[PDB]
Design a protein around this ligand. Structure first.
Ligand SMILES: [Ca+2]
Ligand SMILES: [Ca+2]
Ligand SMILES: [Ca+2]
Ligand SMILES: [Ca+2]
Ligand SMILES: [Ca+2]
Lengths: 23, 303, 303, 52, 23
């Protein structure tokens, strides 16, 4: 047989964006 | 019926020009790039174009990116002339050539600090155009000609004009084609280039061939070898510089005969490298005491 | 994936050999032709193979036509060994090398003056072999190798042995492919070749540049020029044979300086033709009274 | 150094189902150079022996 | 008489605005 276990040994890293004006 | 795409292909790098390089209104045309599929040698669309007769762009949106900081400033206008023979180069007024641009449908103007695109306007009918090099009439082989017109003097951050011709971005194509009639198109769209030049070794024993192993070349590609030597006094001592170079694998004999009675500087070696980018050839000198260097040029097709 | 085909190509000619040329049973292998996509330079499937990562022959049938009269006879067997590392080149029995051939699936047995076909049998699973030139392991990028084994001695109209080896036919691949993941696939396969060797003109008045137009080349194709000569006495009278050839449009120089204090044979020219296959370049001589002939090769990418 | 390379040697085989590499700059809008970023799928195609 | 035909031999040019931050 083969089985597909959803492994739960990870962790996320969400990306946020911004940006400064000249003044 | 052989529909391929959508993909991406780099056309050229666009070089903005200084204010002193702009004299006539014709000098504002930065690029005049034909958008035939057989007109971008080395890219993926042109390599494919030499294996079908006809084509038609279903979607040819040309995507410009900047390569320049946001602290310098200049302004472009960019369009695709669907007629390949309407030439804006004979316009004697500087503003009329850029009103020629924005009047064409599908045109676009932009600051050259940002990424904008120009789509290709489809025809009303269903006409296919030919691939290959342009033989007689441009209206058979070109679907459009991409133009970019500089409308503004190239300024810098310091409030000065740039005095040098500056590469200011790149042109990419997002293409989707049809094709028909698979064939070969007899003119090759590749260009050859002298890859590198390296001298023959100096054998120690007269009339005995010692094998020169050269490295650093690309693996498993065919090369061409022609001799070239510069400023060598062969009559600085006794003897006659007689060289004979043969590959152990390929075909050909490079012969260097510097006898001033009968001169023979001729021959060529066709040989291909192994899996490691190396090859070797039998270098032999009749008079091994003559240590004047002789070189050869490695010819290769790049694209 | 892109499913191209069906189409035809040209592999090679096949040279059936006589009784004396067959000494070992390993000599019976007439052709060892790899049926990867990237192994027939100049053809259509090889040019397309360098624009994708992976290939798979859906239906790839190799076809043979004879180029030989019906008064000579020699039975062939033709098979496509799907394992590219199975090597029949070291089998000691002349009947075992042909039992190994006829037991391959899709093999075909024919007299060599009869046109027949051989189909490639595809895998049971779905493997995409890689395109491009060979690498470390030869089982990643080849789907099959085509072999033609000569199983009987070549014979004449009267039943006596032919004493000379004979080019006898040609192989044509009728193919159908998938491709995947477009790449430009470096280390291109375009081999260069000397197009022709044409010599310079001999101008009248020294120190004058003249225009030598060379004709009969391919239109709008880029070439490469390397200097050459053969068996010339550059000291037959007073003066030093100095030549310099520069194009009017291209790039580079050619220098023929036969000064015995500093002898220089170097330089190259990259120039392309017009629509007529012609171009021109500026030849100048410092002593035009000295009529030593001098050549130059024309290096061109053939495909 | 990553945990995925640590955990990779506790199974036999892998397959990237989704793999998107996300370039983050650390530079202002005052210097400019153009990159091109790709993931070639053949690990033996090497551009390092191109003379153009 | 006089008639006012809406002539349809033109084409638009819509304007979009943007602007880059310092970082
Ligand atoms: Ca054609
Ligand atoms: Ca027009
Ligand atoms: Ca044709
Ligand atoms: Ca590859
Ligand atoms: Ca690759």
């Amino acid at each position: 047989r083969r089985r597909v276990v959803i492994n739960q040994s990870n962790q996320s890293m969400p990306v946020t964006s911004n940006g400064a004006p000249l003044q | 019926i052989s529909r391929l795409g959508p993909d991406s292909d780099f056309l050229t790098s666009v070089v903005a020009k200084a204010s002193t390089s702009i004299v006539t209104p014709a000098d504002r045309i930065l690029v005049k790039q034909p958008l035939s599929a057989s007109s971008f040698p080395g890219t993926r669309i042109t390599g494919l174009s030499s294996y079908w007769e006809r084509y038609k762009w279903l979607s040819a949106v040309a995507r410009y990116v900047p390569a320049v900081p946001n602290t310098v400033a200049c302004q472009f206008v960019m369009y695709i002339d669907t007629d390949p023979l309407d030439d804006p180069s004979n316009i004697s007024d500087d503003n009329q050539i850029v009103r020629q641009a924005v009047s064409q449908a599908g045109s676009n103007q932009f600051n050259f600090n940002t990424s904008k695109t120009v789509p290709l306007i489809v025809r009303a009918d269903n006409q296919y155009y030919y691939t290959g090099v342009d033989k007689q009439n441009l209206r058979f082989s070109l679907q459009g000609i991409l133009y970019i017109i500089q409308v503004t003097d190239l300024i810098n951050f310091n409030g000065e004009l740039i005095t040098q011709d500056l590469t200011c971005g790149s042109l990419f194509l997002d293409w989707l084609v049809n094709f028909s009639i698979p064939q070969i198109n007899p003119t090759s769209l590749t260009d050859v280039r002298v890859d590198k030049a390296v001298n023959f070794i100096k054998p120690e024993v007269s009339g005995v061939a010692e094998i020169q192993t050269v490295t650093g070349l690309s693996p498993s590609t065919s090369y061409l070898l022609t001799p070239a030597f510069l400023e060598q006094n062969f009559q600085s001592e006794a003897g006659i510089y007689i060289l004979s170079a043969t590959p152990v694998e390929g075909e050909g004999t490079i012969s260097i005969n510097m006898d001033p009675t009968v001169t023979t500087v001729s021959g060529f070696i066709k040989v291909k490298t192994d899996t490691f980018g190396t090859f070797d050839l039998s270098v032999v000198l009749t008079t091994a005491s003559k240590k004047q260097t002789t070189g050869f040029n490695i010819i290769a097709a790049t694209s």
